[PDB]
């Protein structure tokens, strides 16, 4: 009997998550579909100074929320993809609208064609509407 999604919180204070690479590597080699491990793999991949964008896109087991909040300040360019496949549209606007290239947003909305999303965005509450429209005029 063992807890998996909180040893990561423990070692986070100790800042030695690379310690957990081999065991979790074998664990995923077995092929466990646990978000508790599939998100920690992404988190250590982020701190690797590498580009884990394709592992982020082709791993249909982790959860978009924790990687997004984690990759909020460190790299929104990956958090937006996390929300994209995770369909976290509200969080996408909650971060990517604030500080990002809004072209990726417009690519997602035109891709993920959803009138209610345009309605939520296009009501003159959001101060950042002019740049994203000034971008989607070209992205369309």
């Amino acid at each position: 009997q063992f807890s998996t999604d909180e040893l990561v919180a423990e070692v986070e204070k100790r800042n030695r998550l690379k310690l957990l690479l081999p065991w979790l590597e074998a664990r995923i080699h077995e092929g466990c579909e646990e978000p508790a491990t599939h998100n920690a793999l992404a988190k250590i991949y982020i701190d690797s100074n590498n580009n884990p964008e394709r592992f982020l896109r082709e791993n249909p087991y982790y959860d978009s929320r924790v990687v997004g909040k984690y990759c909020e300040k460190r790299d929104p360019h990956l958090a937006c993809v996390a929300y994209e496949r995770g369909q976290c549209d509200l969080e996408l606007i909650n971060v990517c609208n604030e500080n990002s290239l809004f072209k990726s947003l417009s690519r997602y909305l035109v891709r993920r064609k959803d009138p209610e999303l345009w309605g939520s965005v296009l009501l003159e509450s959001n101060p950042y509407r002019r740049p994203l429209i000034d971008q989607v005029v070209q992205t369309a």
Binding site: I133, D134, Q135, Q138
Partner: protein, 140 residues
Amino acid sequence: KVANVELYYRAIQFYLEFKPLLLNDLLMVLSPRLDHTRAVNYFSKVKQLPLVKPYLRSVQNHNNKSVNESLNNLFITEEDYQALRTSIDAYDNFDNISLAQRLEKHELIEFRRIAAYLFKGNNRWKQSVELCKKDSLYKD
């Protein structure tokens, strides 16, 4: 690659005030997504239209009204008619009477000859034929 259009009408003024000689390149580049009518209407105020004449000669294909009228005025001032015959023949989006008023008293046999010509484009004899009684007993 710009979203809005008013920056065109500001940048034309910018160059014209600063680097007017390098304006023709922008004009040729920017003619497609541009209301040339406003351009000529604005240039009439500052009156640098004699500069941009060869550009309008290219834009003539669109067959705009103010374009035709202004470029014909410039042919009048330049005192050239061979190009004027091509303009009126190939393009007709303009009033014939205003041009006729100027051509029928342009001090010159040929311009008055055109003033007699274009009347029949309106199907108005008895003035053209009668206008050229005054000068042309040479068969015209």
